[PDB]
Amino acid sequence: GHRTLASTPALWASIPCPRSELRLDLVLPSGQSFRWREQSPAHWSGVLADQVWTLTQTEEQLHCTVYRSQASRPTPDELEAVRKYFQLDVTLAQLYHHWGSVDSHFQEVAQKFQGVRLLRQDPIECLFSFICSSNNNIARITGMVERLCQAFGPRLIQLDDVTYHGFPSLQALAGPEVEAHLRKLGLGYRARYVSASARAILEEQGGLAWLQQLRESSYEEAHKALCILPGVGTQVADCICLMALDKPQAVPVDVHMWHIAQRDYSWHPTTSQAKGPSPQTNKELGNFFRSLWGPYAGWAQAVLFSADLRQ
DNA sequence: GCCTCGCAGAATCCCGCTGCCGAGGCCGCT
DNA sequence: AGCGGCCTCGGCAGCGGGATTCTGCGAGGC
């Protein structure tokens, strides 16, 4: 079973994270990832780097525990791994103050919202998780990615309901027949969007090196490089850039963002000739959000997304 | 004696949207 | 002067499971 606060008191790891800077219940199930579930209150669990992670939040600290194989006191290198995963070197209070000074709508939204953060995931993990998250509700994608991880991932242990697996290796998905096999599992057409976006990594773009060299490249170059891949449009390209490549200038634009804009901000496509999902409208909204907010507008977008979901 | 209220069961919407199909702009050369 | 076709636009629609939202059916009792 998933570890509870009274399960194994010597199997935790505390890191400094105030509740004003971050809130677990508003970030992880808020579309940004699809490998974390809740069983007990204020608990989350998902596999990263072939290791099961369980996260909970106290008033001023974040508590962590791991499943691998029979050892406690997780090593500080994984603490730095989750620190990079959670942008703990970044401060959000000053960013909230900046946004409230420039625009009072974000302050009114954040009058009860304190700490909608963003993550920084592995690009293979985040990319393949967000392939099958297009035109799809969160719970379906969560079960969807869990079933894919069961089918193609190295399992760890059956933890009282369902086995947990490492996220599938890139050699496991770049083969043939995988589209039909995952369509049997129920990925929909996204299965094709996985297959065409697996071999293209290793057979036509240059392997894992081409993708891993994009974490220090320029914005538009990396954006177009991800957009060339099949199934990775501008929304998931910006999602990968923001949550796997450390590009805080990127604002994801989706159904929630556009409903929020058209109902709260009175923004309409000026240069564009329509009001429907389109790359020009996405670029216009990105430029507008960057100009009105600044260089870190994706984080304010994340707060807006968490506000949209819990309402 | 039929019509208000409940009530179970289909229909449709929806959800963190890309690939392909219409379309102007830019070149093309009669 | 005459219209063919490359290149980023705009509009859906493909894939499932859960909510709404309609959509017809029993009891009734004024």
> What is the set of domains in chain A, with CATH numbers?
13-88 (3.30.310.40), 123-243 (1.10.340.30), 255-309 (1.10.1670.10)
Separation in Å: C30 C1' and A222 CA: 75
Amino acid, res. A83: R
Place of tokens 């992670």: A53
Nearest in space to A124 (alpha carbons), one of A192, A189, A201: A201
Cβ of residue A257 lies below 7 Å from strand B: yes
Secondary structure (H, E, C), chain A: CCCCCCCCCCCCEEEECCCCCCCHHHCHHHHHCCCCECCCCCCEEEEECCEEEEEEECCCEEEEEEECCCCCCCCHHHHHHHHHHHCCCCCCHHHHHHHHHHCHHHHHHCCCCCCCCCCCCCHHHHHHHHHCCCCCCHHHHHHHHHHHHHHHCCEEEECCCCEEECCCCHHHHCCCCHHHHHHHHCCCCHHHHHHCCCHHHHHHCCHHHHHHHHHHCCHHHHHHHHHHCCCCCHHHHHHHHHHCCCCCCCCCCCHHHHHHHHHHHCCCCCCCCCCCCCHHHHHHHHHHHHHHHCCCHHHHHHHHHHHHHCC
Positions 160-219 in A, CB within 7 angstroms of strand B = 193
Q: With H, G, I as helix, E, B as strand and everything else as coil, classify residue A74.
A: coil
Asked if A48 and A64 count as a contact pair (C-beta separation under 8 A), the reply is no
Residue–nucleotide distance: A56 CA to C28 C1' (Å):
55
What is the stated resolution of the deposited model, in angstroms? Answer: 3.7
Method: cryo-EM
CA-CA distance, A263 to A260, in Å (whole number)? 5
Is strand C within 7 Å of residue A276 (CB)?
A: yes
Tokens representing A28 are: 């992880």
Identify the bridge partners of residue A165 per DSSP, sorted by sequence position: A155
Chain B positions with any atom < 7 A from a protein CB: 14-19
Calpha distance A274→A42 (Å, rounded): 42
Nearest DNA or RNA nucleotide to A257 (CA to C1'): B16
Question: Would the Cβ of A189 be found within 7 angstroms of any atom in strand C?
Answer: yes
- A286 Cβ contacts chain B strand, under 7 Å: no
Check if residue A235 sits with its Cβ under 7 angstroms from strand B.
yes
* Residues A283-311 as b or e (16 or more Cβ within 10 Å = b): ebbbebbbeebbebbbbbbbbbbbbbeee
Which neighbouring-strand residues pair with A155?
A165
A34 touches strand B (CB under 7 A): no
Q: How many separate helices (H) and strands (E) can be counted in chain A? A: 15, 6
Å: A189 CA to C14 C1' = 7
Q: How far is the CA of A199 from the C1' of C12 (A)?
A: 28
Nearest nucleotide by C1' from A187 CA? C15
User: Dmax over Cα atoms in chain A, in whole Å?
Assistant: 61
* CB distance A195 to A178 below 8 Å: yes
A283 touches strand C (CB under 7 A): yes
